[PDB]
A paper describes a structure:
Dihydropteroate synthase (DHPS, EC: 2.5.1.15) catalyses the reaction of 6-hydroxymethyl-7,8-dihydropterin-pyrophosphate with p-aminobenzoic acid (p-ABA) to yield 7,8-dihydropteroate and pyrophosphate. In so doing the enzyme supports the biosynthesis of folate, a key metabolite required to support the synthesis of DNA, and proteins. BcDHPS displays a triosephosphate isomerase (TIM)-barrel fold, consisting of eight parallel β-strands surrounded by eight α-helices. The DHPS active site is formed entirely within a single subunit.
Numbering used by the authors: 3 to 28, 42 to 64, 73 to 292
The structure:
């Protein structure tokens, strides 16, 4: 029992007495009721996710935000495009999830206003071309914390209050598949830099169905990684995570219901 710092996130003041589950959502009706299921399954947030023409990315994301606004659960956007961020916030999205660390030109300007939650992810890459890079680290843990601290500073320098910001070590983006990813999972609480109050920024962790998983289970396909994905989530929560982003929602909630019983009893002594 440690408590991750709260996250102001749009409509919702989110507090982490228990860690929360982000269901990954990504036909428009197909996905309307796919989200009613996720909520019923125990999802506490919904992650609305070549690449795509702005014309298109907008057609497929903006209706979904308005379609699901009234369900009243935190709605999160997986985008690095400022135009996408600008639009989605206006349509009432609660949290922006950006692989690029709010580095694309304009990104910080598009989100410095309002109450939305912001999660800055670590990734090794050249923002200009959007080419993901090859690993290169001193201590990968020091390096990821260092990077994310610079990004929390950048956001705060443009008016963003410390408490709207959570961070993400970016399993799978520029990391040696096992050596770097598991180093970060093993050291998870040490990957978040300090808020001005001294508390660490809450951490979001997304490992679901990822390569780091398939590499330790003799190479199973992305859809054959459920129990592996659950396991990574528990390890992450056992080590500090505030939120875990997953495709397999009910399994993850079941697991975390066991973990919370355990912690509830370690506290009763």
């Amino acid at each position: 029992t440690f408590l991750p710092a709260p996250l102001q996130c749009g409509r919702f003041e989110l507090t982490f007495e228990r860690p929360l589950v982000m269901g990954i959502l990504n036909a428009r009706d197909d996905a309307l009721r796919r989200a009613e299921r996720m909520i019923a399954e125990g999802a506490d947030l919904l992650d609305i996710g070549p690449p795509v023409p702005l014309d298109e990315e907008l057609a497929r994301v903006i209706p979904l935000v308005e379609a699901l606004r009234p369900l009243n659960v935190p709605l999160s956007i997986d985008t690095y495009k400022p135009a996408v961020m600008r639009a989605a916030l206006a349509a009432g999205a609660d949290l922006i999830n950006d692989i690029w660390g709010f580095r694309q030109p304009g990104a910080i300007d598009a989100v410095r206003d309002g109450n939305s939650g912001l999660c800055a992810m670590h990734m090794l890459g050249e923002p200009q071309t959007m080419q993901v890079g090859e690993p290169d680290y001193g201590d990968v843990v020091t390096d990821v914390r260092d990077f994310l601290a610079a990004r929390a500073q950048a956001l705060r320098d443009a008016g963003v209050a410390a408490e709207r910001i959570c961070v993400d070590p970016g399993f799978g983006f520029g990391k040696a598949v096992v050596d770097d990813n598991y180093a970060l999972l093993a050291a998870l609480p040490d990957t978040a830099p300090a808020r001005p109050d001294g508390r660490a920024y809450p951490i979001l962790a997304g490992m679901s169905r990822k390569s780091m998983l398939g590499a330790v289970i003799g190479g199973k396909p992305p859809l054959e990684r459920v129990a592996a994905s659950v396991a990574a989530a528990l390890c992450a929560v056992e080590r500090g995570a505030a939120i875990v982003r997953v495709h397999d929602v009910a399994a993850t909630v079941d697991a975390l219901s066991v973990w919370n019983a355990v912690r509830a009893a370690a506290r009763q002594r």
